[PDB]
Amino acid sequence: NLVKNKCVNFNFNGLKGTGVLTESNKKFLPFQQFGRDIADTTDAVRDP
């Protein structure tokens, strides 16, 4: 099971990331997995 607003070292299908998970108001398609900003840090992830 996943957590919301509770920092963890989450592994979304091989993607290891740390931080707080907050709901996103920008919506791509779920198959479109993740993006990166100007700093190239991962910005979002979709869970199965």
């Binding site: 740390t18 100007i38 700093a39 840090t41």
Partner: peptide, 20 residues
């Protein structure tokens, strides 16, 4: 402001934009 553009640390200015 309009024209300017993990493991990274930025410390806030001791004098923020407001105080500057």
């Amino acid at each position: 402001f309009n024209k300017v553009t993990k493991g990274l640390t930025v410390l806030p200015p001791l004098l923020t934009d407001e105080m500057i």
